[PDB]
Amino acid sequence: DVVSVADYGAAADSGEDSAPAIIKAVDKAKELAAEGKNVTIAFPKGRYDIYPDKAERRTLYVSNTVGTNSSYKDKKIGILLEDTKNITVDGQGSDFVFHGKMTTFAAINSRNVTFKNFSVDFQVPTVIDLTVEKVDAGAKTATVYVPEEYNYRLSGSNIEWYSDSSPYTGATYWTASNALPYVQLYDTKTGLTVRGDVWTNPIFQNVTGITDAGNHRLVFSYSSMSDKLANATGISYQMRQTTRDHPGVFLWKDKDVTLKGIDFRFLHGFGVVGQSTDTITMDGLHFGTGEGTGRSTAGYADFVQMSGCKGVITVANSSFSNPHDDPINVHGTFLQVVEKISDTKIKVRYMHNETAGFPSFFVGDQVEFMTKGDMLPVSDSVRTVTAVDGPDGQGGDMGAGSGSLTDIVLTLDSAIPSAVAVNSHVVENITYTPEVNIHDNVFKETPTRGILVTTRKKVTIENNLFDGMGMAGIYISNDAQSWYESGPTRDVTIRGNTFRRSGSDAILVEPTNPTVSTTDTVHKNMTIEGNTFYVNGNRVLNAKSVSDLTFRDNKIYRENPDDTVTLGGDADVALAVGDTRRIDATASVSQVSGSRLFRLNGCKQVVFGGNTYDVGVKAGIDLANMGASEVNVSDDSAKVGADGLVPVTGSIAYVSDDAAVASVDQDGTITAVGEGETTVRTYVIAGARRMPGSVVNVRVSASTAADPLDGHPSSVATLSSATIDGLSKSFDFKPGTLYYFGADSALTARAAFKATDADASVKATLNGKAIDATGADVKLARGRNVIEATVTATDGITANTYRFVIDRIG
Template identity: 30%
Template sequence: MKNFITFMFVLFLGFTSSAQNETINVADFGIKPGKDVTLELYQLIDSLEGKKNITLFFPKGQYEFYPENAFEVYRAVTNHDNSLKKIAFPIFNFDGFTLDGNGSTFMFHGKIVPITVEGSRNTTLKNFTIDWEKSFVNELTVTENNKEEKSFTVDVANEKFGFEVKNNQILFNHYDWQDEIGQNMAFDPATRSPIWQTKNYYLKPQSHKTAKIVKIDYKTAKFIDYTKSLPPVGTVFATYGNSPGANRFAPGIHLSNSKDNVLNNITVLAAGGMALIAERCENISLDTFIVTSRDDRTISTRADATHFLGCKGTIKLENCLLEHMLDDGINVHGAYVKVEKYLGNSTFLCETSHVQQWGFIFGEKGDELMLMSRETILPIFKTKIKEVKVLNERRMLITVAEVPAKMPEGKLSLENLTWYPDVYMNKNIIRENRARGALITTKGKVIIENNYFSSQMHGILIEGDNNKWYESGGVEDVVIRNNTFNTIGYGNGESYPLLAAPLFTEDQRIGDDKFHRNIDFSNNIIKSFNGHLVDAFSVKGLKVTGNIIELTNDYPTGSTLPAIHLDFCEDVIIEKNQFKNFNFPIKIEVKENVNSIKIKRNKGVK
């Protein structure tokens, strides 16, 4: 009888919970495909303030969003340019909010952020595509070249807006602004990836006297003496303005200060920044999150496909396709703040140093901190935050529970130990992009398995630095297994499937201890033109076992670099790795400062 009563009570709770869920068909509020629905959507979302367990349901179609009637608020968006942001879906302070696009396309025009989730819990975004009428990336396709004239002619993908040439400078017209060339990269149309030795084709005048741009007609221009090497016919140049300040202002989805976020079956075809940027969030799950380019474009997003700063809980990516973006597939890290001055009374005057991190929440009362040396980037003293007083976007006062009996000399910084996530990546494809496949710098548990990587630079970069980007997080437990790495480093052939090394600048030095710990790189398949496997520096506990490295001829073969390079490492196992069909020497290079190393039963190594 008791079990029956318990069962009925649970059943009643289920019915009650279901009754509390409310599905709203947006068509009932005048939100219909084929017209600008920005204002109507804002009014609807605004009317739902304070309600829980709401689902916004969109009948399938293409919905248009313009900036003129969009909700606007100043937003500090990490790794982007802070500014007033116009937002189409301002999902602020909700509990149990679901956005179900039902297969719809949300088409954006101009400088507008599609979705911002702020201060919310239990948010689900699913079943829609994000696109822009005109991409934030300007694409130029080479149609002919002339060696004698050192010139090449391009078709400009004008997408309605066209371009101008003024004062020997090309200006790309957008919704209500113009872009200069700025940052740019050449892509190979056959591989849809950055072209081999892409730096040779960087659009930059080689001579102020002879470099010239000529507009031929509404879609054609000629570049004279503008690149180190003449680009092959078919080359696609992606240009995207200058950074910071001009090309990272409109991410596709921004998650901030929110808990339990789920993103399912979402496609992002363009963004004026990252497809997804998340900061100060707990628990984020992505399943079938797709970043790719539209059929009539080569490039998808201006920056990373996914990026996570100062998060905790678990970040999970499964069944995702991330391709054709102009930066990394995924980046997970914390952030150091510089100690400008110790003021006494356990209080530090601190500065957020990188311009695209200004305004982010570094820490709050109760967060565990580590006092760090900026010279060696090693930890010194652990404590907790008692109080944070924000002075402005850049500076803050941080009062801690305890400080060392004697304050260390030299440059210092603080690291937040509380806000680091676990990461799980399974069955994802990251390929055909500029930069790296994955940057993982977190103290949480990391498992990367059954994925496919093919990137212009390193496949997986485990870095961290305390003097440039200030991206923190010496790793403590990383497993990378059963993945496929294909033609990693096709930018110039110098990159590795795995690079684990903190970034040092000229004014920094190696300390007494290692920065990274416990990295297991095992049972992966590497299809390689250069024979590279692992490059590791300042790692304690490195295992490289059971990997199969096969020669491929997709790019020029050979390398002057070792297959495995170890510097200032400890407790290393290099075992049962097989190098197959290589017709050039495969070397393992171990510096004298490497301790406790076992190298055995590796095949194909000289």
């Protein structure tokens, strides 16, 4: 049972609006679904343009966006499955290009529906990503690359931005001028994204003029060159409005939704929102800009928001790059008790201004009450909802209504506990709490937190890579003070993940309760095991109010090891055959400053065991609002209430190139053996790593007179050469400099990389795709091309990722 959009007027690659034809095709699919058929809506492979003008329009109130604001209550939706079941939307590899401000696709009141096999983009994205390519502090100018997707007109020192236009009316969908309200910084050189001063864009401070240099480059002139702007070369400044007028995808009141094999190249307004939906599976989603664009923002805000859902939320085999908020947030909403009408009837209120106007309770749901101050449940407070009067989330009333989009009146099956009082207690819907399974994903290029999750059901975060999270890699809060986002946790497992280039704590557990309790804790039963943490000054774990917290069998490594062996005793020795000389070699092993790796704040029944700590890290524990009697380190080497620095005492090994000329024992005594010249090499072993140190050259004249590296594989993880030919100007490669940036008109290049240690593994990519690191002819696409070379030493632990970034000039 197949419905092709081609039979309803949507030709592939037509350049015409497909929105009316998709509506008709969905209509037919719904007819067949209502006959009991499993239906596929097929898109013959190609580009499809979907405009908002004729798209389905719905009044919708959406968690974590714009709250009750009536200016934005009406949503345009490009592909809407409503009130249906058993329908797969199969793009068959098509490219869907949306226009203006709209939601891309949605399912509402629908069961067993799937979206798969297409990309999602906008003609003119609403985040404007400007790369500074050159700055001239002497002339006080900067050269700014405006990606080809954007339209603009110049007027003196102003730039005016505009979208594309309606085919039906000629209306411009939106316009703006100069700096948009919010900006964040994607450093294309390092591949790190951070927030700085988000309300001050340095491209647009003290601009005196702008000139079009052609090829989509603008030369800005300034009355003064700030420090922020002087160091801006290679930075893509991602600027936008902050109003979340649309969800990017909306999955409201569904059951068994699957999204899979979708490339989200840009989402306007917000990310994928699940709301009051039972079971959503997300598999093989790639949020990120890719080859062929100079843009860098993929998400106007969050990528995945699961608000008040239930069943199982799965995110698997997916990748996340350059949102303007958290990649993943699974949570519910606390509503505050604002009126006790009777012992079985209360009014509750949406307290945060971006979440309001939709139902968080249906008849039959179970609720539980919480004391705001200590964020602990009221004992014996689970009740079943028997009646709901409040907003239905599409502008109408559930029950009698409440007279307000922020207020819901609940009737409960039995008298609530006497302790529950207005404004001191909140209510959580405990039916709409999901199990969470996030595994085999890649998170990078993110200015905020990687994963937020607050649910009482089973949570598994397993086998993910975190690189460059600007804030905590994993953040588990529970908040009835500012964000009003619910979910005390009861069963969390964080296992097999790798954290790299962490901008803050790798893992942060911090409910926002002001009052720290000695009887109970907010969260319980959290197990953090088998992860690898590369550390460089920030904590591994910062946990507040968790009981039965276990941290075991993890591996902690220095992210930037700097080891050597110095000599002092002359590096040049001449010997007579039979005589001996001793090397005065002393090992040098770098250590990581900053915080103790662990902090615990009001926790109970904490156990550390079986963890591996690299030399030179502060494997120690800070305690707050708790005693050491709640922390068990009997089976671990972490120290309570002390730094617990792992000693930086390296051992020294000695290997001669040619022992027929000169031999050496493991004390550093050279023995002249034969005539000739040879070099004896030192190596510093420090924990699981082995680095070379200074060498000694031995010259031995006539007279009448390796196995210490076994179990110590090499940790050399540098390149010795990196050549990129075919460019107007060449990079000045240095083994110690990882990151390079340039802009060039070249259409092709030849790249070759060589490891310092020929045994080390080199993995090279162009725009994420593997290339032959020994030598590859590469095509440079439109926009920003990124050649990455990752060298992994033979120890399997030490790696460096080099980046060569070229903006194409065309």
